[model samples]
Target: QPTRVILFNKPYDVLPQFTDEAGRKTLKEFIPVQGVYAAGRLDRDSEGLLVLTNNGALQARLTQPGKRTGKIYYVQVEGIPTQDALEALRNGVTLNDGPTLPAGAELVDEPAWLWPRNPPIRRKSIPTSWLKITLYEGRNRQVRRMTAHVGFPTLRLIRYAMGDYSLDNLANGEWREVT
Candidate 1:
């Protein structure tokens, strides 16, 4: 039988770990399970979908770079991107390590109903923009860095989906069992 899986919409400021230093709240503060592990991480500053499961193989499949699960993000960037910037993102941007893999990115509507952030993003007179980005490769802070390289620094990030699982209908800090 397959191990149990749970989908959680992790809220901002929540650490992905069961325990945290510096008195920050963590998943253990919200989730009540002892045996499950996060399939992949959503940064403490990021808010959105995260999967937890008791199935070790499934967790490995999602987190392992070898398997390369596509992760989709809804990002708020600091400025409107020019056509050249957009093309750079589609082609791939060279990071400190090397050129990143090509990714799917496009302008997207800012959702009218998004919850106001607790510590709202720092503001300036210049307007910001939104983008939907999907990556077949997972790298630390990759989305934020990629957008910044294209001259649109990312101000906020939220993972809307991971493979077939999503944050749909799950409010911040909510979780539901997946059969």
Candidate 2:
């Protein structure tokens, strides 16, 4: 088996999967690794750090919900959320799938260091803002839905970190081997 170690700064509109039936480009469109696969998935509409490995055991360790690998996100949302809404997210709001685990979330000022997003987020006359969210467990579209459920719909979603790994300086579609 190929030895493990891979980091990617995934661009928007790229699926984490090797092949996507939705006609969207995937990681395979960028990386040439033959046997490696993503530890977890980022929705095609989302962007930022993504990890892949050739080790099945490591893959299972990171992707398994019970493993408790923390996933961090920087989400840009429309409108300010009420305190009640933020608390709801803090206390774990119930979703159709189930109540999500409590997450670490806080309103964040615009990060001047943020890279310019491809097909930049649209501007509106109304107010908008960003949040830094850290979750020990990730679920399908969980971040977006959670904010929306609390009346603050997410406009641009970006994953910034996973455990000890982070996007750092890796650019869109760029990959670097972790030593």
Candidate 3:
């Protein structure tokens, strides 16, 4: 039985899935491995660490909501968030889906190692700021929604780490096998 795993630095504007009939880019174009599949998903516009595994158990352990694996994201927001807003993120915000679990939210400097985004995020007169948020649960667009609810809309989002795996120095579109 193959127990292969891969840590891929997914680039922005690429789908996490293997196929797209709409002619957009997908993981299949970058990952040549035959059996491994993405353990979870990153939104098409989001970037960074994406895990793939050939072992069913490994995949389930990483992705099952009940397991509570931590996912840390580095977010760039449209404007600077106040201490109150950051507190709201740490305390949990009520969304249309319901109240979120408390997350570890803190302001952070823009990562020095970050690769520039293609086409760039829209430039506005207002200044932008960065944040590092760690969530124990995966919800659809939850990070973006949480920030928006707290008056700090996310301009760019990146999954910097998941569990013990980190994006490290992998360039965009780069991938490496995990032992």
For residues 17-129, write the lDDT of model 1, one tens digit per residue: 77657878888778887788788878988888889888888888777775667788889998898888988888998998688887888998997646666677765688999
Off by over 4 Å in 3: none
Candidate 1: stretches off by over 4 Å: 20-22
Q: State every prediction's TM-score relative to the real structure.
A: 0.92, 0.89, 0.95
Per-residue lDDT over 114-165 for candidate 2, one digit per residue giving the tens place of the 0 to 100 score? 7777788775576887999998877788899999999899998889999999
* Best model number under TM-score: 3
Q: Where does candidate 2 have its weakest 10-residue lDDT segment?
A: 19-28
Cα lDDT tens digits, model 3, 1-179, are 56988999999999887766486888888989867878898888999999988898888888887778899999999889999999999998899989999899999888889888996876557899999999998888999999999998998899999999999878889999975
Tell me which of candidates 1 and 3 scores higher on TM-score: 3
Which run of 10 residues does model 3 get worst, by summed lDDT?
16-25
Per-model clash counts, in order, read 0, 0, 0
